[PDB]
Amino acid sequence: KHNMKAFLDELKAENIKKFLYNFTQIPHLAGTEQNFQLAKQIQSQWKEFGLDSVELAHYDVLLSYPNKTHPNYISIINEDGNEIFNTSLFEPPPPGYENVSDIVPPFSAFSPQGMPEGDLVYVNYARTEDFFKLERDMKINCSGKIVIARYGKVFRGNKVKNAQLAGAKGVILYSDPADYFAPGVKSYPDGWNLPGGGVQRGNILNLNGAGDPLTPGYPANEYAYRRGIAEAVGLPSIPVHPIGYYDAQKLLEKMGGSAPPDSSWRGSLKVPYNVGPGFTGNFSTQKVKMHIHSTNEVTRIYNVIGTLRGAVEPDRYVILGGHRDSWVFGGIDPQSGAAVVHEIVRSFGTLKKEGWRPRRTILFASWDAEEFGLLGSTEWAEENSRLLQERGVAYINADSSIEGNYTLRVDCTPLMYSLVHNLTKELKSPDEGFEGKSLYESWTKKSPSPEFSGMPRISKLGSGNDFEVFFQRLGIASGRARYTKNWETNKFSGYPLYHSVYETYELVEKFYDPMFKYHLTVAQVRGGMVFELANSIVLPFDCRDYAVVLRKYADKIYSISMKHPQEMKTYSVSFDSLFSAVKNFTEIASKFSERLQDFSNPIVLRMMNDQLMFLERAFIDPLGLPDRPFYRHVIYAPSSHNKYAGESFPGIYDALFDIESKVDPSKAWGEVKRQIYVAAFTVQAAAETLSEVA
Amino acid sequence: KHNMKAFLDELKAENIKKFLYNFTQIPHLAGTEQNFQLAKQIQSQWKEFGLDSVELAHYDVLLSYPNKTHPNYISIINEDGNEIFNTSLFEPPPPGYENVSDIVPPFSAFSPQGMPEGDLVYVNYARTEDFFKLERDMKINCSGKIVIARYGKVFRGNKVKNAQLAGAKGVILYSDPADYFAPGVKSYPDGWNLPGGGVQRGNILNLNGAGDPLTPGYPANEYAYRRGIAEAVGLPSIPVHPIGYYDAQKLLEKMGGSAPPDSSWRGSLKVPYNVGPGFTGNFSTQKVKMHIHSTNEVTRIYNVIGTLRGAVEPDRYVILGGHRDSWVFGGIDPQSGAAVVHEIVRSFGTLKKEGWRPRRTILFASWDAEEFGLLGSTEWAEENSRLLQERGVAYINADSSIEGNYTLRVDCTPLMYSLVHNLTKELKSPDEGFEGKSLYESWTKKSPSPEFSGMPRISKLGSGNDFEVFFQRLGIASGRARYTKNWETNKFSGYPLYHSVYETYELVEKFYDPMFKYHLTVAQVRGGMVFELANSIVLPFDCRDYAVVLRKYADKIYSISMKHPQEMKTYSVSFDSLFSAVKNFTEIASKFSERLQDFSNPIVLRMMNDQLMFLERAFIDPLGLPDRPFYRHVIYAPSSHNKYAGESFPGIYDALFDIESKVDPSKAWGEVKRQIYVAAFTVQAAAETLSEVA
């Protein structure tokens, strides 16, 4: 038989291992020849595997690279202008790779050029609340200063945005061992920790969903009109560069001015973590000088798009996508994901060669330039938005399959909660001590829901990966799943070797997953989800799960507002409409579920499948969120303080944030009321898509 | 049998006559009790007629009314401040209606209040080219002047916008007998011409598709947040008032300054049509003073929405809609249309009572507040946009059925051209001399296509009626049809009694259509279109007709650009991408048509019906046109110079308009190139929705 068990049984850990080795021997940086060659290899192999069509979709997008003959570095400079200490020009390469060429040195992609010189201020994680503490409580002014911030907690582009608005003239990002060195584990190559010379690459854009900075709204095809660089979307205005903790120690050790305000500001280095500005007495005349010479360049990128045509509903698309470009070798990010996608394609293709096809069309994507701002997925979605609008059932992302070996991590739309619970109850746990137990059992034990007993945690979607355009712009039901660590406070910081040269095949094979059993489990989860979405007669979405969360989110946003009772009285701020809409959605969803269970009629079925498919779509507002036109989902958006985190009722949340500091409370509370109206209307309008159609 | 002939045969001229009489005995001004009572009557009757459900959908929108105890008028004032001539406070009511109460006096809806006093400048029709002539050629400055303009040629809101930007401090609109008095016909009540005391009411908003000025984007429901009046959309900034030609003569007769520049500036009154500014020598010290005291008021409006549920595809909607609110009695506008809709509902209901249902759902709408800016249709579409997006097959409008007795007039999407041709070939011509001939034959003879021999003229859609939100915002295939006059130069001016108290039942019964045969023909066209759209197994849309027009429109926009060859050389302005996209659309449409003719499989059928339905949808750009976010169709928009006219490739057209006057030609030609890219992309993306789906 050709059922899900047949699909799942065909997946093999040893194939995932072979693919991971094959994809990680040389760097695959976006825009480079190496990565184009890998695209062509994947295209050829997906064809061999049995897909109906496999094409490359190319775009010409703005990328950023260091200047090979004018390298980036930071100095401490004396009053005579002598550079007395310099940060490293490259990470010491790992054993056996010291002769690999074209390893891009650490840099912050899209930094502007400059050579700012100044006094340092230390800003902890450079979060919104860290700058509030500095400027409001400690009365420290960052204007004209170079800020030094530790990586962790929030997306680095948010740090840079925050520093820019505080008036900084430059930002130095570093990896503190508090966040990137687990106690009792050795540094690479002897363990999975970051060494003092390791550095985390990554872009510092704030694109808010736009994709290529030069072509917002439209694909960057051959005839595209491009914005001038001065009008580009999302580019930082001050130079930025990342460094390792050996170099950070040298910059932080001489810091003077004010003591850290409390222990949450101190990392694990042997320095005081003084906030500054500037250095202690003896070194008061020394400064820090940055030298950044990176260039932004329009560069061709290539997505591979494979199609497995549906037997019954070929005009309904289930998409499994993940990226292929990496900063260096991509041992975890992304090739641990890409190897899983490759084995999933091979398995579906095996069934296809035996005469099977899925009910609905499955599209498989190998995206390019994810590391430079989700560029490949977003340009392709811009090109194909009308097809995706009207035909897109679901998107499952497939970046890194592992970031630890402890338990499952899942973020997805509520419409997928029941699917994930049911699938994980049918899969074997790979965990020590849970032999013979379901993955649902191990996951629920290790990562309990904060809300419900005997349920696992599933988080909201924000941004930070290639599902963003599908979910936040287009309103296609999306999900993601991987294996993770037990390090809760580090959930947005990345594993220690994230975006470093040290993330290699050997890292994964020696220290993360020697038997590739966690990779196999992730392949079963991602592939099983795609299988069910593409083959179930009724789409496997439960609208009642959205009703449950909407009440949760309404209670939460009401509780934030209720911190300001006198203003709610003064400005007549009522959440009554939003609770009414949620109540209506709950009632209508319950009645729809009854009809769905109670309805031989393929028109009623498809009518009902269309209601299920367009339900996520109903939460899209074609006017977008305030000043973020490409974030259009009214229930979820990436947090304005941390792109990696999802925020619920984002338009209301942002209207309320720090509202006590707004100079015109009438205007500010008016906009809260406006956002309550938009949210109440949108929830009611989504509910009504589930009513009887006539 | 229950087929289209059965539906068409059930329609009766004598019923349309009875309904028209019933709907025109008292005024039905939007927001008044009279119009709410008519809504309730229609709701009850549509229920009686057999519809499955009939509901009222109400909204609270900004309307505008004169002040009953502080009337609007214009004076000529002497230097001592004595008002020596006053315009009328009301139109002399027609015979037998001199005791009807609540006839709203002539006013321009949404005029601000004020009492500006100044010198007159005469501006012909106040078109963009009339102001170019005044300011650029004649060197006459309208700043601080009161402008007097004749109605005709373009939407009055465009006149007001133009006058405002020329610096006018007020606008007086009047009906010149050149445009509103056909030679050799008597004035009402003895014929269909406008008497010297008649006045055309009408709104002067420039909403650009927004609907209620206080709630753009969202329905004006009970909990809506409203903009403050200072932020309202589309309100004029200077007072405006309309007058009849007896009063105009008194204002124009003393005009001095410059002679009219040529004969196209002279109307038919016995005055010189001097442009001014101000009066001739003896009267040079007299001024004109306006007194406008109208108020804008949020007021409840009511749409009636009737549903006839489809037997096979109940989640596909064919909509027949037209408005019910009138300025006064609405003899032609709108009740000649509403009477036709009423008889169409009665006929469909007769079939329903015999056991028939249409294949797809038919929705019938009686819209409110069309006269105040398409408010009822637009608020309802805003409320239901997600259902309409995903389920809307077509919208057929049904305002005035007659504006003459000469031949048919049709404006519709190219997707409906073949449907209209085929239907009209099967209907009887009602015209004298064409007894026994088809309507297609008479129509083609009287209104030949400028492009093709043996074809009739069908025009583009712009705005001016309730189809606007469905077509220009949502991208639902739309059409309209009525009987018209033989007066080509008057095609946007309105029939002589347009929006006057004199448009009564007697006007229609005596002078337009005594046998109600033209009304019956229009009912057969509108109803036949709805019947075919709701019942044909394959949707009756021909994508190849869009391919033909797209080439026409591309040739036309290229030819406009080619008036500037040196700039096209300098700025490398190429239309190659747009012609490539049109060529691709033509090829793909041809192949789709082959499959459609060549494909027992209801999934392939519906898949193909969905491709047909979403084809109009593909021309929508979710970012809208420049500074007009609610006009989203890339091929058509209402002309920026005349809301009644449709413009093709509007984004390119507006980028090119008057480009030789732009101060920064680099920037201006850059934006032309941007608009070519958007249009080429959009045409290619629409073409690709017709490709094989996988």
Ligand SMILES: *[C@@H]1O[C@H](CO)[C@@H](O[C@@H]2O[C@H](CO)[C@@H](O[C@@H]3O[C@H](CO)[C@@H](O)[C@H](O[C@H]4O[C@H](CO)[C@@H](O)[C@H](O)[C@@H]4O)[C@@H]3O)[C@H](O)[C@H]2NC(C)=O)[C@H](O)[C@H]1NC(C)=O
């Ligand atoms: C959740 O679904 C429910 C339906 O079960 C839906 O209920 C609707 O609520 C609206 C708003 O309360 C009701 O609107 C009323 O409609 C009547 C006519 O039916 C009007 O007369 C009312 O207006 C009068 O009263 C107002 C309030 O005092 C005054 O402001 C106004 O000036 C008038 O005096 C009012 O518009 C509507 O009837 C019901 N529909 C039902 C029960 O079928 C509710 O809106 C849904 N929630 C959301 C957020 O959409």
Ligand SMILES: *[C@@H]1O[C@H](CO)[C@@H](O[C@@H]2O[C@H](CO)[C@@H](O[C@@H]3O[C@H](CO)[C@@H](O)[C@H](O[C@H]4O[C@H](CO)[C@@H](O)[C@H](O)[C@@H]4O)[C@@H]3O)[C@H](O)[C@H]2NC(C)=O)[C@H](O)[C@H]1NC(C)=O
């Ligand atoms: C109408 O449909 C046709 C398909 O029948 C479609 O043709 C496509 O045209 C584009 C643009 O010309 C082609 O893009 C090329 O793709 C190749 C790889 O396939 C690239 O190597 C090309 O780039 C090189 O050449 C460029 C031009 O000199 C340089 O600017 C560039 O730097 C490179 O040197 C180029 O991107 C595409 O291959 C075809 N696809 C086909 C034939 O299948 C056409 O685009 C459609 N029209 C519209 C408006 O969409």
Ligand SMILES: CSCC[C@H](NC(=O)N[C@@H](CCCCNC(=O)c1ccc(I)cc1)C(=O)O)C(=O)O
């Ligand atoms: C906007 S352009 C982004 C470009 C690039 N993207 C990433 O590197 N993404 C990594 C981030 C890893 C650290 C944060 N972890 C989470 O956010 C997280 C949430 C849920 C689940 I299930 C798994 C992981 C990733 O998603 O794996 C960048 O950020 O530089």
Ligand SMILES: CSCC[C@H](NC(=O)N[C@@H](CCCCNC(=O)c1ccc(I)cc1)C(=O)O)C(=O)O
């Ligand atoms: C933006 S709010 C509009 C509110 C209101 N609308 C109308 O009165 N509409 C009348 C206009 C009649 C004169 C112009 N004729 C055409 O445009 C025309 C084109 C094609 C065909 I087939 C038939 C007629 C109408 O459509 O009948 C207004 O204009 O004050």
Ligand SMILES: *[C@@H]1O[C@H](CO)[C@@H](O[C@@H]2O[C@H](CO)[C@@H](O)[C@H](O)[C@H]2NC(C)=O)[C@H](O)[C@H]1NC(C)=O
């Ligand atoms: C990754 O695997 C691919 C596929 O097996 C290898 O590419 C093949 O290499 C052989 C020998 O050079 C050629 O004959 C084939 O044409 C290639 N097939 C393709 C590209 O589809 C590639 O060598 C492997 N890479 C590494 C680093 O081991």
Ligand SMILES: *[C@@H]1O[C@H](CO)[C@@H](O[C@@H]2O[C@H](CO)[C@@H](O)[C@H](O)[C@H]2NC(C)=O)[C@H](O)[C@H]1NC(C)=O
């Ligand atoms: C840090 O790097 C800089 C740049 O290479 C070094 O400064 C240069 O030193 C050379 C040789 O002494 C001079 O000829 C250059 O003019 C210097 N350039 C600049 C910009 O100062 C510096 O010596 C290095 N510092 C340390 C401690 O290694």
Ligand SMILES: *[C@@H]1O[C@H](CO)[C@@H](O[C@@H]2O[C@H](CO)[C@@H](O)[C@H](O)[C@H]2NC(C)=O)[C@H](O)[C@H]1NC(C)=O
């Ligand atoms: C997850 O599994 C549950 C348990 O089998 C499914 O819920 C059952 O669905 C069937 C078919 O509609 C009903 O007859 C049962 O009453 C349901 N049992 C319940 C709710 O306890 C559920 O549909 C599955 N979720 C999916 C497929 O998304």
Ligand SMILES: *[C@@H]1O[C@H](CO)[C@@H](O[C@@H]2O[C@H](CO)[C@@H](O)[C@H](O)[C@H]2NC(C)=O)[C@H](O)[C@H]1NC(C)=O
């Ligand atoms: C228009 O026609 C309607 C429907 O026949 C008339 O309304 C009816 O009037 C009678 C007598 O007053 C009542 O018994 C019914 O209840 C009404 N029916 C409705 C409202 O559905 C109305 O009188 C006619 N109007 C004019 C001006 O002739």
Ligand SMILES: *[C@@H]1O[C@H](CO)[C@@H](O[C@@H]2O[C@H](CO)[C@@H](O)[C@H](O)[C@H]2NC(C)=O)[C@H](O)[C@H]1NC(C)=O
């Ligand atoms: C035009 O109308 C105005 C306003 O009613 C008339 O002016 C008024 O005349 C009365 C009686 O003589 C005075 O008491 C008012 O003070 C006047 N009002 C204003 C604003 O001037 C005027 O007489 C009318 N002119 C003509 C020619 O009929």
Ligand SMILES: *[C@@H]1O[C@H](CO)[C@@H](O[C@@H]2O[C@H](CO)[C@@H](O)[C@H](O)[C@H]2NC(C)=O)[C@H](O)[C@H]1NC(C)=O
């Ligand atoms: C308008 O009528 C024509 C003439 O009957 C229809 O075109 C025919 O359609 C049938 C069915 O697909 C084909 O077999 C013929 O070859 C067509 N004849 C032609 C093109 O000359 C046309 O489809 C009708 N238009 C509609 C229904 O929108």
Ligand SMILES: *[C@@H]1O[C@H](CO)[C@@H](O)[C@H](O)[C@H]1NC(C)=O
């Ligand atoms: C990189 O730096 C070199 C050496 O100074 C310079 O010649 C070249 O212009 C730079 N390349 C760029 C800016 O792309």
Ligand SMILES: *[C@@H]1O[C@H](CO)[C@@H](O)[C@H](O)[C@H]1NC(C)=O
């Ligand atoms: C910070 O410093 C600059 C002076 O260089 C000043 O313009 C700015 O207002 C200061 N901000 C605060 C909060 O002191």
Ligand SMILES: *[C@@H]1O[C@H](CO)[C@@H](O)[C@H](O)[C@H]1NC(C)=O
């Ligand atoms: C794998 O799990 C073991 C046992 O709990 C742990 O000691 C090891 O550190 C884990 N590896 C990683 C990379 O987390």
Ligand SMILES: *[C@@H]1O[C@H](CO)[C@@H](O)[C@H](O)[C@H]1NC(C)=O
């Ligand atoms: C209308 O005019 C009267 C009489 O001057 C005045 O009392 C009232 O305020 C006005 N009504 C309005 C502005 O709605």
Ligand SMILES: *[C@@H]1O[C@H](CO)[C@@H](O)[C@H](O)[C@H]1NC(C)=O
């Ligand atoms: C028109 O008149 C005013 C002076 O009242 C002036 O400000 C404006 O620039 C003038 N425009 C032209 C074109 O003369």
Ligand SMILES: *[C@@H]1O[C@H](CO)[C@@H](O)[C@H](O)[C@H]1NC(C)=O
């Ligand atoms: C109706 O047609 C006749 C004959 O052509 C014409 O004389 C008459 O004016 C028409 N009526 C109207 C209102 O156009």
